[PDB]
Amino acid sequence: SSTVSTLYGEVEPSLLEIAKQIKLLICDVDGVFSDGLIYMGNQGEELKTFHTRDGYGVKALMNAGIEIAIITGRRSQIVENRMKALGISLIYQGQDDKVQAYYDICQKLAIAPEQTGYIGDDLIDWPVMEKVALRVCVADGHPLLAQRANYVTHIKGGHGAVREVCDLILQARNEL
């Protein structure tokens, strides 16, 4: 074939061409930054997990001048805390309609969809992904989303899937 090695497997050269040119990466939270689990307690405690290797990836992308934004349907202090800690400021929570949040991001940043990527794990993510150039489903994402993606990560959501996509972009940019 015509495939090129990554740190994680093989991709079409056409995908690296797309990845090279990304200036905006938008991520869902649950199932992408986390593994999709919501930890619930009898006193109404709620936890969520994030992976340490993802932080390093996001920071590397932003150091390269790539904007990062988050769009999620849930709303938590957890997400505010984590995203602020990673230095991500474009945070959209409580979104039933992810398309409108995406439009708001577009109007703020003025970045074209050909230069935008999105990492999702479920069907609610599809209306935005469909519009952009890099369409990522995490390894364990909904199989119907995985069918529609142009990159399916090797690493599971919440375990380094975000880092994998950061590494893909950096490799494409010849910075890794």
Q: How long is the chain?
A: 176
164 near Mg ion, rule: CB under 5 A: no
Strands 10-11 and 4-5: antiparallel
Min CB(126)–a copy of itself separation in Å: 8
Question: 67-71 and 90-92: which strand pairing?
Answer: parallel
d(Cα 39, Cα 75) in Å, to the nearest integer? 14
Q: Nearer to Mg ion by C-beta: 11 or 117?
A: 117
Tell whether residue 28 is among the known ligand binding residues. yes
Contact call for residues 8 and 164 (beta carbons, < 8 A): yes
Q: Running DSSP on this structure, what letter comes out for residue 117?
A: E
Tokens representing residue 160 in the block: 């380094």
Name the nearest CA neighbour of 28 among 124, 150, 147, 165. 124
Ligand-binding annotation for 121, yes or no, is: yes
With contacts defined by CB under 5 A, name the span among 29-37, 43-51, 57-65, 93-101 that binds Mg ion. Answer: 29-37
The reply to whether 140 sits near Mg ion by the rule CB under 5 A is no
Near Mg ion by CB under 5 A: residue from 35, 54, 67, 121: 121
44 binds, among Mg ion, a copy of itself, none (CB under 5 to 8 A by kind): a copy of itself
Closest separation in Å from C-beta 31 to Mg ion: 4
- Which positions make up the binding site for substrate? 30
**Binding stretches for Mg ion (CB under 5 A):** 28, 30-31, 121-122
